[model samples]
Target: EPSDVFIGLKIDQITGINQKEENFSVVGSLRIDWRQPLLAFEHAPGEPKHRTYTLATFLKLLEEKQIRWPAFTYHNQQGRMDFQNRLISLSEDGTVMYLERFTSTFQAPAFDFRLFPFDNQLFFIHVDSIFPQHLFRFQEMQGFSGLGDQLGEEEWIVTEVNTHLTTHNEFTKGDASRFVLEFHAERHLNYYLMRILIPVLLIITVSWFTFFLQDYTKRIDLAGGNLLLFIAFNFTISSDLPRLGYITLMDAFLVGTFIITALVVLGNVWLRRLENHGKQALARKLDIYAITSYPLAYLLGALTLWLLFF
Candidate 1:
């Protein structure tokens, strides 16, 4: 019969989250429990019920095949994982428990930022056995696996934690048992609102007011300056994210604003040419239409983007 290994993970803290790199760093502890008759011993009157070994001693026993251990590895781990400490304990009842504290970064390739600043992300930690299913299988340790209350991450609120068991197939190694721990996090919106959206909205509204001026030359200068400011905002937002093939909701909003501001600059130049050609009446009529349509265009564009992306 395959040994049933119970596994649990507790995240002590989340140290870093990088959207552009598509990974996060965490400090956590992992626990594995199983029955190993080879390592069990009788509890002597003077000895404790359980005996513990350090990582080096455990590895020596493993190399000598004196004890059985389910060797597992992280499937989504990126770079080197630092092991702070490890312990293997053997109980009198043939029960073995292995615990390790470590720090590592894991890849989150499934992250979708279509909604960007308002998005909720799912992060995963996958552990898989090296031995085939005939030798070992995984079972979740309920009530012991979860995130700490004070997770140290200020920009995201962890809303849920879940665990699952699955089979991982290898061409040469047959099937192995896999344990997955997943968590859902939602970004805090206050930073996006205060730092990005509010400033962009102010620039757009200021450009709208320039339409009230009768001097086409001054209107052109102000509208042209707004277009430059919008471009700077675009660059600032782009630096926060990776170069994805698909456009995000924030990207769509910024692009729409840029196009409208550019059109305003063109309209002002056209009105100036009309007035210089002695078509003063026509220029006045066209300016009235541009002023009314400028704000209406923004409202309609915002509605369209929201309906499409949200």
Candidate 2:
């Protein structure tokens, strides 16, 4: 019946839109329509097939949102109208404006209703975060970080957020402007890898054990098997990925990891004393770091990479 965003702004200008696609592997896209230039593009506007947020982190945000907020209401304060996500911010004229958000950036298909279209889920209603106001100064932010903040409610992903896009409109309008952003998710380099990073990494890392073997024949057998296992891992994953001549972030990370693991294996072989010095063999000697730092570092790397998903 009545609208809160209809003070002085026209219906078009009042619409500040951004869509968040769910079930994506990484970098959810935003269908942005800030006509008045609240957040405009600088340098090169992000393309449709670019990475924004990681798949893991993006999904985490939705799960966390559902647990925290009861029924995502209109404007966080119920009224005559209903909106899921809301953004309250200063317009170009520094006027206090409250824009009702349409989606929470989550495409919960099995929920009461789906977040976007099934076969072609636009997922426009999803609004993970309004992003920090400071970054929107234009010149400072060349591109969108996709999502923000780390900690509590006031964190970039938290309390201060007031801007939201509404997708509660059910009717197909005269001319519908739909925004869609899609992501292609593959594993990262650190630990969750399937590309050259893993084969190269696991092969190289496992190769270290070869160096510690007291006998050459035994070392050769284990090394060969390790290589085969990693190769299999790579092949299994490769079958699912798109063939790309270009190296991705996964390629780079694995290359670095491969180098590091190869060095570790080599070091153990050189430093072995199993023959004469009554000390621990190369394998036994290196076990200390492998047990402590290796796992610790692996977990740290994994945690770091996984946290990036949000």
Candidate 3:
């Protein structure tokens, strides 16, 4: 009925697959592979890290909607309820799922669920919950095919969860490869949105005022401190990116910012020198140019990247 369902089936077993004998296949309605309960977030150390997410949703009406079971025969009394299992765990580096719990079920498909990884930070939780069964999933994942079997249903439940952890595992792995290792997911931050565009803009604006500071010492000192801020920004930015390869849009923007800030510093130094050397007019002109161009480049770079996304 399932059209050679066992042809390419892959299931995890405690024992090794023996090719010689005991070669069996599950030929029935269908099978559903769900590893989507995994959700992630960001948190801080010494902070009481906690989160609450729905694990599974059980409604009381979907049973009546099953095409296979008669309205009065579902429970010998015609009642329906929802059943969904969820997962929870501590994330290493708050990126990948340490995989504390995974809903391990052989039951029919229930709600159409999905998993999303949130951020890159110190500590976080991978949350999971099930909501009420949605009808759209039926159309999407097939409601007509396994209509009478556990593979298709109007009502279902999250029967069990596989909560297992392995140690001395590889720390560096992702995608399906993490099966043998413990890794937080790869965190790809939208720098133009999350870290760079916002923070850098703030710093540049605050630093811009010092250019107007009549006192050379005050302006230079502020510039120096802002330089430190930018460096810290760079460090924070760099740590989040993969250390090996090459530059991305953010890299381009950050490098440009760094150069501009450095140039600003040099310009100010020369301006003071110009004051010392009676070249004040030249210094002011250079300062204005540096002030406007730096921020424009960062913003313009961000705009370009934003366009690329579209």
The candidate that wins on lDDT is 1
Query: What does candidate 3's lDDT look like per residue over 1-310, in tens digits?
Result: 1110000111222111111221111122212222221223456898646433332321122233332111100111012222233333334333211111111212211111111112221111111111111210111122222111232211112222222111121221321110111111123335346656687778888877777786577888888888899889878757654443434555666677778778777767777887898777876777678667766866786687567633
Over 4 Å off, model 1? 65-67, 171-173
**In model 3, which range of ten residues has the least summed lDDT?**
69-78
Give a tens-digit lDDT track for model 2, residues 31-76.
Answer: 2222223222233445432223433453475386552211222121
The best candidate in terms of TM-score: 1
lDDT of 2: 0.34
Comparing 2 and 3 by lDDT, which wins?
3
- What is the per-residue lDDT of model 1 for residues 51-101, given as tens digits with 9 covering 90 to 100? 888989778976787655787889888999999989888789888788999
C-alpha positional error of residue 23 in candidate 2 after TM-score superposition, expressed in Å: 16
Residue 258 Cα positional deviation in candidate 1, in Å, after optimal superposition: 1.1
Better-scoring candidate (lDDT), 1 or 2: 1
TM-score of 3: 0.39
Model 1 clashing residue pairs (backbone)? none
Q: Point out where model 2 deviates above 4 Å.
A: 1-217, 243-261, 272-287, 307-310
